[PDB]
Amino acid sequence: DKDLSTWQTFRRLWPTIAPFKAGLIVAGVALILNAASDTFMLSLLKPLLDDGFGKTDRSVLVWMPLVVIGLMILRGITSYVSSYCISWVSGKVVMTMRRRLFGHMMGMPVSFFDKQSTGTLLSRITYDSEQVASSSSGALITVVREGASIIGLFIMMFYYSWQLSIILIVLAPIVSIAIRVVSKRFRNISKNMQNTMGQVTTSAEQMLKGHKEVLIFGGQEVETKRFDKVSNRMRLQGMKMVSASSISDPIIQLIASLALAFVLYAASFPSVMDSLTAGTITVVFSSMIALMRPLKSLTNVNAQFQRGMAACQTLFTILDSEQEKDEGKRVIERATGDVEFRNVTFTYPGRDVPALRNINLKIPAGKTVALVGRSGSGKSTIASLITRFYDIDEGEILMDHDLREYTLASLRNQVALVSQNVHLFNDTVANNIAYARTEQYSREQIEEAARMAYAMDFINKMDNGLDTVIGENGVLLSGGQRQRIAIARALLRDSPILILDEATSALDTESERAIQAALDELQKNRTSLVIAHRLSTIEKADEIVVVEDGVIVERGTHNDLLEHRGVYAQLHKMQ
Amino acid sequence: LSTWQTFRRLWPTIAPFKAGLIVAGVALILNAASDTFMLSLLKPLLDDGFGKTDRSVLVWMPLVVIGLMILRGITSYVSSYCISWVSGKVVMTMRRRLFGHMMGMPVSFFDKQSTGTLLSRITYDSEQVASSSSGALITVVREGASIIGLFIMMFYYSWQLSIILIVLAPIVSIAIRVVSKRFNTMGQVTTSAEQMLKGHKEVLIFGGQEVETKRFDKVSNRMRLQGMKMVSASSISDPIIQLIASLALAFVLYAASFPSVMDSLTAGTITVVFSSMIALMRPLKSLTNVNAQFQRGMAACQTLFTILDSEQEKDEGKRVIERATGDVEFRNVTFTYPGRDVPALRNINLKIPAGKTVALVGRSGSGKSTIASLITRFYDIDEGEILMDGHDLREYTLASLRNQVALVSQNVHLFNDTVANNIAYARTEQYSREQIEEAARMAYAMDFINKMDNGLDTVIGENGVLLSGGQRQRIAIARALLRDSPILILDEATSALDTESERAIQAALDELQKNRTSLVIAHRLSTIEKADEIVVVEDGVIVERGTHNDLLEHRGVYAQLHKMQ
Ligand SMILES: Cc1c(/C=C/C(=O)O)ccc2ccc(O[C@@H](C)c3c(Cl)ccc(F)c3Cl)cc12
Ligand SMILES: Cc1c(/C=C/C(=O)O)ccc2ccc(O[C@@H](C)c3c(Cl)ccc(F)c3Cl)cc12
């Protein structure tokens, strides 16, 4: 199962890697020469013992130290080169994975974000994309280098004492099965301790975060005894974790030791020790010893690699997720702003009570309409629907054509959102007022935008004034100032359809007559949809609609609904 | 001086277990000795086994190797188990100590530091200390035994070559020094992605996909460059070090050529001498880096002694109250958060007559929440006096005082356990499951509990991954209801009001607030208008108050405040 899953996942990833195939190829050749350094250095023992102590000083003297120094230079160079090439390929593929995930997540449905913590996604894309590369790199390096060295060593063993090698080979399958069984018995118990440590973490974190309810409700004994239990289980699982390998390693090298001691017990018998010499035994047996590390490394590569692909899969699924549905094909430059809800009903995902039902309303160009009604109702939902954050279930919302006929980009350039909870990207004030159009709007343009939004009183108080850096997640700006900055954005862009949210707005602003003048100047021109909560806007609004339980129950003018004096006057009395 | 004083402050926690350390130490000694005895055997094999003596190649070697390997494996297993046992015991003792102590600290301690930082103190630092110190001990003993076991063999089998190597060791040391000396962007990646996911709403309108894509491009590529840089630096270091060592060894071998030397050497003598020289390269590497790891361990440990030496909140109150159906009163209370010098609360006087619900409204940042924080004595005041039943809150022992208050807030933490057990938190045995279940429906929390797979015995699993914002709130109400606490503190600033079933929560509050003292940081219109007294807070002071004939018109701020929300 999992070999197949991991291999299809890998064939998915190879497109991302193939552009850096040159780096891969180079690293591989360097690894080959690296393994040959070691092979050719172990060969150097034969001429040393036989000739250099068969009465010849030239060997030990002139060249042997020279060749060793040169081989070590070669080893170091192959080492550094392979290291660098692999680290380069990995850096590239990791960064590529990350740009893919970022670009994709940016284009996801809003439902995807309100539901998931920003963190989990952020953490996964930084950690997993690095792990895929680490595991893949290690696996490749192992196969190449150590599979080259086992070849070198097997051939050398066969040239020097063709006989002894086969005794090792015939022993190989049963030794392999023995080692594999011993390995599978004990060492495969990381997740046990991962669970237990997750419990340690959970207890500690619940106590630290919920410190205040522990204090009020007096659960110190409960939390304590709980930690006493889980920490001891964590201890015991750490000890079982070590015991696994403490038991499995000596056993395994003992098995290999038996195989080698049999080979050596044949070294004493006459048929083969006659042809051979004291220098050949040395190189052959040292080859066999050297082989133990490559064999160990190679028989764990599937573990390493399948792990890498198991993380690559969690990245791939995020990529496979469905992005925002966008099939408009219609584009509009500077819409007029004639927005009409016809028979709109809509229920948020997962819920079972519609946030809106049979909603019918009409907003003509250049004029405003206030959505007042019991807090918690669907006026906010109405606002959210015009931007296609959520697709209605039944009916149709028209802009001049159904919103879903329009490209999301074109549809969204028509809409300007002014609320207190606007996001302040950490950057200059000017670049926050001209978020994604720094190239299109002049400095004087931005200056006048901020002036007309009655924001310059608190900008001129900044450190560098208008070029001061707001952000750092918005500490430097209060809400009454965030509103005016949002208003500056909207004035600059001069979008044809405004969505104004005074719900979250703070009317407790030392400067709110200025916020009111900014709004008056903002909405002179264009269609406006206010989730109203101010005396000023409901005073000047062209139409007031009263919403409860996702239904429009009364429509009319302020004065006409007070002459009427029905539900609107009930709200008037209440607020 | 500090690096060792910290270890001696720590040694008391370890000394109960020195019994394992010494056993591990002997095992390490014998392990080094086994590895040395095999290099010893190297000479008999060659010389004797091919001084025309199959006696050695059949008898000596095949069985002595197996014996030595058995001993090696057992010494390894034993030292492993001993060190692991002691290390587990100390990390357990220390994690338990830190959990208890941190829990006993005041809220002033938690405001400064992140919760995740304090969690790291328990999960990692406490393990890193024992890790680094265990590794220090093992390196010291094991490799300090191997180094001498090898040096002896070296000088014995050929004093000539060995002194030649020793005379070179100083220069080699200085050289490896000079090169091992030559041995933010991640924050920008996490930030560039996090403030994208934050402003996804603002990125979709204004069309900020392009500018964000290229911002990321920049940041990601910059960290890729940094990440390659570090590995390149690390990579080059060791090749050069191996080259240096190999130079010295090649010179030694050029020396073995001279006839005065070679004559002493045999096929086996030189073999084992150079074998031990090479083996010595890993003891030396380990023995030069050991004090660095001890340093980092003891630094992590003095971090935790900084935590342990901090003081737990003060509970000198010797007064107990079984239960207090009584009023809480603020008498000219003034407060300033430690570290700030502008009082969050100036001269304040506030009465919450028993049974009555006093709803206090105030601007989001104001000291309205500070009041409810003061009643439970999360912080002590600077001037004034808070009386519960006409006696200073500080007169009481904190346990009794907090038994009288129940907190209800959306963000109330739900601890990984059964729904039922969360409702009877810290008093699971006291209340019968009938009491619990009644408390559950009385809070309208049952509408969603039976939907759960095991209902009331379903466990909130994986740090609270199951429940909704609005569900936690009804569970908190159930907890306070069941406990039936005289003083109700109801936090509605964190409430998250827009929910699927808010009428349920509202009626739950209706039931809870009734015939019970309630002090609510109110945002809801309903809990406000049907409250006994409304109290406005502006900055550190109270501006104006009002009942039901005054709720009609307030002199101060209430008009605009009510108009905003
Ligand atoms: C020692 C060893 C490990 C290592 C596992 C670990 O260290 O965890 C892993 C896989 C192996 C597969 C075959 C095998 O066959 C023996 C006959 C053999 C060969 Cl073919 C060559 C040289 C030898 F020395 C031996 Cl003994 C030994 C193996
Ligand atoms: C190889 C090595 C490391 C390791 C550094 C690293 O790996 O980072 C660290 C410190 C050293 C100090 C002296 C030294 O002297 C050489 C001549 C020597 C001796 Cl005295 C004994 C046996 C030998 F095999 C060698 Cl070569 C070598 C050292």
Give a brief outline of the structure:
The first copy, chain A, is α/β, with parallel strands linked by helices and 575 residues long. Helix content of chain A is 64%, strand content 10%. It is classed as translocase.
Strand and helix layout:
2 copies of one chain form a homodimer.
Chain A lengths: L1 H16 L3 H23 L1 H6 L6 H50 L4 H5 L2 H42 L2 H25 L3 H20 L1 H7 L2 H48 L2 H4 L4 H21 L2 H20 L18 E8 L9 E8 L4 E6 L5 H8 L7 E6 L8 H6 L1 E5 L7 E2 H5 L9 H10 L3 H4 L9 E2 L8 H15 L3 E5 L11 H11 L3 E5 L3 H6 L2 E6 L2 E6 L1 H7 L2 H8 L1
Helix pairs in contact in A: 1-13, 2-4, 2-6, 4-6, 6-7, 6-12, 6-13, 7-10, 8-10, 17-19, 19-20, 22-23
Bound molecules: ligand 95X (2 copies).
One copy of the ligand Cc1c(/C=C/C(=O)O)ccc2ccc(O[C@@H](C)c3c(Cl)ccc(F)c3Cl)cc12 binds next to helix 6, helix 9, helix 11 and helix 12 of chain B.
PDB class: translocase
Keywords: Lipid A, LPS, inhibitor, lipid transport
Assembly: dimeric
Description:
- Two copies of one chain form a homodimer.
- The two termini of chain A are 65 Å apart.
- Chain A has 575 residues and is an alpha/beta fold.
- Chain A has helices at 2-17, 21-43, 45-50, 57-106, 111-115, 118-159, 162-186, 190-209, 211-217, 220-267, 270-273, 278-298, 301-320, 379-386, 408-413, 429-433, 443-452, 456-459, 479-493, 513-523, 535-540, 558-564, 567-574; strands spanning 339-346, 356-363, 368-373, 394-399, 415-419, 427-428, 469-470, 497-501, 527-531, 543-548, 551-556.
- The radius of gyration of chain A is 37 Å and the shape is elongated.
- The first copy, chain A, has two domains: 1-320, ABC transporter transmembrane region fold (Up-down Bundle), CATH 1.20.1560; 339-574, 3-Layer(aba) Sandwich (Rossmann fold), CATH 3.40.50.
- Helices cover 64% and strands 10% of the residues of chain A.
- Chains A and B meet through helix 3, helix 4, helix 6, helix 8 and helix 9 of A and helix 2, helix 3, helix 5, helix 7 and helix 8 of B.
- Residues 165, 168-169, 172-173, 176, 238, 241, 245, 248-249, 277-278, 280-281, 284-285, 288 of chain B line the site of one ligand 95X.
